[PDB]
Design a protein around this ligand. Structure first.
Ligand SMILES: Cc1cc2c(cc1C)N(C[C@H](O)[C@H](O)[C@H](O)COP(=O)(O)OP(=O)(O)OC[C@H]1O[C@@H](n3cnc4c(N)ncnc43)[C@H](O)[C@@H]1O)c1[nH]c(=O)[nH]c(=O)c1N2
Ligand SMILES: CN1CCN(CCCN2c3ccccc3Sc3ccc(C(F)(F)F)cc32)CC1
Length: 368
């Protein structure tokens, strides 16, 4: 009843926005996703995602996609190593826990979600640049493309979103840590020592404030990340110049075993990213001119040290879609308010845990 003869615009087709769209569409809602990516073949850079029972997996189950996820996800164990390459502990996944949070490639998750939507639900090459509330509909302005209208706008376009001001004046913050990520293709050949160290498990190591994480099998590539407190001199490293990054990393990792150094020396290109947070604090704006809200990283971007990132976003989509379709609310505004009040609770909890882990993980003495 709330959305009958109305349409919904979701801004951003990340995992959270696409899940949003599926959950609305399967209830007969007219919904479009506007995604800035030029088309669906653009690869998504990054590590794997794990969906949790009761949150991310509950969104997939409601959508009819839980088995689809299971079929493309891998449970993976964890090895903790020290800087010398000694395995300090090894924890494999017991078979009764194979469904707790198996890891899925981000492109596979995207494909699962896109395949679940009706044709032309996602409108590619649509970068939203501005919103304007009319008498009853939002007008959406896109970069060099014709405008569109919607009764309800859901901001789902990630942590650096510039279209949040109708919802909140909160600004994204840097937390003081920095991340460098890279993929190694054919790792069994190109970083064989480190690949054997992982031994089919994820690997984590920490030494003198420098952290290293690796997944040796993300659809055949090894993905790794290195994190550290942002240096005071900084960004004096040009991530377009691999020689500049290799030089910086080899100094920081000078005391690490050569299996780690070879990882750095053979990487083709590096991606640098300051850690950021979009902090939940005082309430969002009340009495907005037309119905609008935010989900996912746009709502509560958070340091990736607690593993709660995408799962809290998928809970947003589950809660918001239920409120918009369960027939219990007298207005779209009230369904939104109910979602936001719930999400401020679990969102603040996740953000606190992420921020606490971050403080603790970068203390000079930290051990996993
Ligand atoms: C290094 C690192 C490591 C991890 C993680 C992050 C980082 C940086 N995370 C966090 C997790 O990946 C994150 O929570 C999700 O990607 C959030 O998904 P969203 O769909 O909200 O945003 P996401 O950023 O994925 O999607 C936003 C979409 O909007 C599009 N877009 C942006 N601006 C637009 C515009 N103006 N108009 C239209 N479209 C626009 C983008 O192209 C993109 O498709 C994580 N999480 C987790 O659960 N487990 C983990 O292990 C990790 N690990
Ligand atoms: C158990 N689980 C606890 C929480 N996460 C936090 C690390 C997330 N992540 C990361 C974090 C900061 C900077 C870069 C990266 S890339 C990356 C690569 C592999 C793994 C890896 F190791 F998971 F495969 C994890 C990460 C680590 C593993």
């Amino acid at each position: 009843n709330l959305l009958s003869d109305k349409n919904v615009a979701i801004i951003g087709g990340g995992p959270v926005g696409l899940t949003m769209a599926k959950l609305l569409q399967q209830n007969g809602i007219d919904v479009s996703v506007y995604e800035r990516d030029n088309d669906r073949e653009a690869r998504i850079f990054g590590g794997t995602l794990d969906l949790h029972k009761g949150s991310g997996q509950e969104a997939m189950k409601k959508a009819g996609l839980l088995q689809t996820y299971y079929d493309l996800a891998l449970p993976m164990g964890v090895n903790i190593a020290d800087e010398k390459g000694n395995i300090l502990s090894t924890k494999n996944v017991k078979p009764e826990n194979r469904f707790d949070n198996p890891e899925i490639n981000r492109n596979d998750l995207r494909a699962i979600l896109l395949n679940s939507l009706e044709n032309d639900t996602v409108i590619w090459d649509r970068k939203l640049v501005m919103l304007e509330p009319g008498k009853k509909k939002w007008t959406l302005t896109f970069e060099n493309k014709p405008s569109e209208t919607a009764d309800l706008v859901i901001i789902a376009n990630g942590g650096m979103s510039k279209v949040r001001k109708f919802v909140t004046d909160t600004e994204v913050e840097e937390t003081g840590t920095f991340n460098i990520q890279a993929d190694i293709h054919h790792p069994e050949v190109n970083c064989p020592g480190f690949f054997q160290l992982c031994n089919g498990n994820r690997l984590m190591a920490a030494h003198q404030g420098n952290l290293l994480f690796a997944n040796p099998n993300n659809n055949g590539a090894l993905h790794f990340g290195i994190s550290f407190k942002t240096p005071d001199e900084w960004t004096q490293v040009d991530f377009q110049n691999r020689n500049s990054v290799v030089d910086f990393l080899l100094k920081e990792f000078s005391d690490w075993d050569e299996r780690y150094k070879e990882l750095i020396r053979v990487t083709s290109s590096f991606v640098g990213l300051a850690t950021r947070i979009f902090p939940l604090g005082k309430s969002w704006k009340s009495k907005r001119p037309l119905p609008i809200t935010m989900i996912g990283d746009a709502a509560h971007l958070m340091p990736p040290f607690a593993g709660q990132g995408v799962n809290s976003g998928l809970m947003d989509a589950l809660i918001l879609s239920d409120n918009l379709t369960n027939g219990k609310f007298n207005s779209i505004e009230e369904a939104i308010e109910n979602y936001e009040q719930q999400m401020f609770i679990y969102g603040k909890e996740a953000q606190e845990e992420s921020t606490q882990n971050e403080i603790e993980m970068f203390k000079p003495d930290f051990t996993f």
